[PDB]
Amino acid sequence: KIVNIGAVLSTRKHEQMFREAVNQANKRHGSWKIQLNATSVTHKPNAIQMALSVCEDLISSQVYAILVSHPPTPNDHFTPTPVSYTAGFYRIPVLGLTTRMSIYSDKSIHLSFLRTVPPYSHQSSVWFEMMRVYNWNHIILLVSDDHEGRAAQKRLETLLEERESKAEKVLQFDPGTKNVTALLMEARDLEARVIILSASEDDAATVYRAAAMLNMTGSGYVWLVGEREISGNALRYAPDGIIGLQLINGKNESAHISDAVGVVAQAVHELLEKENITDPPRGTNIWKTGPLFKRVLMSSKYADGVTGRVEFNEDGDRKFANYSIMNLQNRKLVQVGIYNGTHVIPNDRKIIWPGGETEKPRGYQMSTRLKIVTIHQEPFVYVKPTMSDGTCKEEFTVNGDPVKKVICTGPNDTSPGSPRHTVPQCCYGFCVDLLIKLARTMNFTYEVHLVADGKFGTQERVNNSNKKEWNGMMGELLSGQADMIVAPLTINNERAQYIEFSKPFKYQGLTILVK
C-alpha cells in the first residue's frame, strides 16, 4: 500500500515542496490506503560515486519514478544519464525535467527515459512556421554539434518534406576550431540571405564576431537563432537585428515540480486501477511490468498544470509548448511575438531588422555572372595558348568573318603529366559562338574555366566507402562550382534525373570510325 518515489535535488526548499506535493497527492484522490513516502538525494561533485550511491539508495528504496531537476550544474556535461541507464536495467521509467538535449530522445539507448521539456528540434518546427509566415524557402543552416546536427537537420528535412524544398547549404565541423571564415564567404556568395545558427555559446559568439568582422551583418540579412545562442558571452557579442526564441517557464522549477508530481500521482492511480501489481527486487530478474507501465504512462492525458495541456508523444516528449519571441532591440530584449501550440501571434510591439525598414527583407539575390564549364571538343571548342602574354591572335576566316575567341583557364596536361599547370588560354569554335550569341541575346556576364580531367562524368561509388559520386562536368556542376554546362552533352535519362535540359540544338547519333 506504499509507493516509493525517488528524486535528485539539492535545495531544501524544493525538497520541502516535493514533500508537500507528495502529501497533497492523496488529497483529492479520496481516502485510499495508498501511501506516499518521499526520498531525495543531494549533490556530490563526482559522478562514479554519485551514480553508485544513487543506485544503492534507489535499490534499497524500491522507488517507482526518478526525478532530476538540476539546470544550473557547475559541470557543463549535463549528465543524469547513469541513473536512467540503471533504471532501464530494470525498466524503471525516468522523467527528465531540465536537460533538452536530443540524446535522451533516442529510446534505442535510453530505453526508460522521458521528459516534459521538448528538445531544440521543435525550434526547427517553429522556424518552419516562421518560413510559412514570411514565405522563405532557401536557408543557410550552419551546425557545429554533430550529435544533434544530424537530428536537427533530420527534423528540418521532415518539415521541408511538406514543401519538398531543400536547405541551399549545410555546414558541420568539429567545434573548437576558428578558421571558419572560408565557409562564411562561401555562404555569402549565394542568393539566400536567411542565416540560421544552432550551437553553444562559444561557437555562437565566434560566428557573430566573424560575421561582424566580414560585414556579414549588413542590410537584408535576416538571422534566426534559438535560446542557447543568445546566452552567456554570446549575448555580449550579439549583433543587433537578430531574432531569438525563448522558452516559457524554462527554469521555473517550482511549478515544474508541482506539475510533474501531479502527473506522477495521477499516473500511479491509473496504474493501480489494473491488475498484475509488481514491485522491484533488491538488486538479475527484470521488473516484468516495465514496458507495461511505460505503455500505461504513454496513454496518460491531463487537464492540470500552470503550463497547460500536458500530453506526451510516442517519444515521451511534451506537446503544444508555448514559446516567447525576443528581438535584440538596441541590446535590450523586447518581446515581439508569442507562439501557441500551433500558431504564432505577434504582439503589439514592432521588430527592427539589422538594416532599414521593419518589413521582411526578401532573403534572395541574383547574379548575371555565370560560371560556364565545358570540355575540349575537337570540332566545337578550339583551344590555343596565348601568343606572348594573355593575348589571342585575331585571326580571320576566309569569309571576312573575324574569329571570336574567349580567354579560358584550365590545366595544361593530365595530373600524372602536369602536376600543376593552369594558364589562361584562348578558346573558340562552335560552342563558344553559341554561348556568345546567348550572351548577346540576354544581358549577363560569364567566366569560363575548364574541367580538371577529360570525362563527361560518371556516378562512381567510393572504392572502399562505396559512396556514389559524380565527376567531370557533372561533378563540377553538382559541386556548385559550375552554373551552366555548355558542351556536346549526351541527353539521357540517368543525367536528366539530376539536372534539367533545354530543347536540343543538335540531331545526330553514333557511328564507327575506320581507316
Binding site: D401, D433, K437, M442, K503, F505
Partner: peptide, 24 residues
C-alpha cells in the same frame, strides 16, 4: 526559348557554314 528562336530561323545555318558545313 532562345534555342527555339534560333532553330526556327537561319542562324544555325550560319553556324553550320562556319564549322559543320565546311569541307575540304
Amino acid at each position: 526559348l532562345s534555342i527555339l528562336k534560333s532553330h526556327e530561323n537561319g542562324f544555325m545555318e550560319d553556324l553550320d557554314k562556319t564549322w559543320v558545313r565546311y569541307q575540304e
